[PDB]
């Protein structure tokens with residue numbers, strides 16, 4: 001079980017060592033395209049790139065590069081696109097990717113400003129009456145409605161392909177209290193947010209892969225994706241003990257480097273999966289406990 005293992009690691013204080021072992025074992029694949037000179041201004045961080053084999057290619061002839069990876073969890077049968085926070089020059093690419101990949105959901109785990117520094121472009125409209133138009137990729141984006149909670153906000157956006165004039169609803173889930181290189185305030189508030197995304201249909205197989213990002217797209221994004229997949233695996237078999245959290249993380253790291261950035265984030269993942277297992281194993285009421293414990297109201 002995760003619990004037994006969690007307490008063994010906890011009792012000896014081996015999280016840093018456990019986490020370092022994962023770093024050491026992680027896949028190392030080429031990122032030749034991300035490192036091309038022409039793509040320099042398309043990367044937010046020098047040391048965070050998508051592998052060539054799993055990168056999302058934009059469907060344009062000019063330059064198909066974007067810092068984004070497709071994480072295809074074969075056994076869990078769920079896919080995620082993890083990407084960096086868009087730069088001022090890549091917002092059009094970001095939405096082009098959303099359109100071409102047929103995504104319904106965008107999960108954002110960072111704030112535009114964190115620790116006094118700018119971490120992400122303002123890539124979506126904050127006012128209904130001020131829609132955005134990305135001239136390079138011929139897309140229009142409109143804020144349709146906003147539901148503001150205490151530590152997250154849900155937005156309904158309308159994305160229009162100006163070329164074909166067809167439109168789509170995009171759901172934007174914005175977690176506003178998850179510090180960079182940090183952990184959520186609680187398993188409860190994190191799980192409450194995760195289940196809000198799930199309940200929107202954004203994670204369903206009839207849609208393209210959900211887009212998950214923070215600033216770099218590996219730490220908080222990794223943490224979010226890891227928990228979700230572990231709970232999905234457990235759900236499929238109704239067998240908590242069949243899930244090897246570290247193996248899953250390692251499987252995810254075949255598709256994008258550096259997923260989960262700290263030992264504490266790893267520790268949190270265990271917590272979130274362990275708490276979430278109560279819901280998966282038949283205690284439907286625990287979801288309401290999370291909502292309360294999370295204090296989303298206000």
Ligand code: VO4
Pocket residue numbers: 110180181214215216217218219220221261
């Ligand atoms: O902006 V993230 O450092 O949690 O990859």
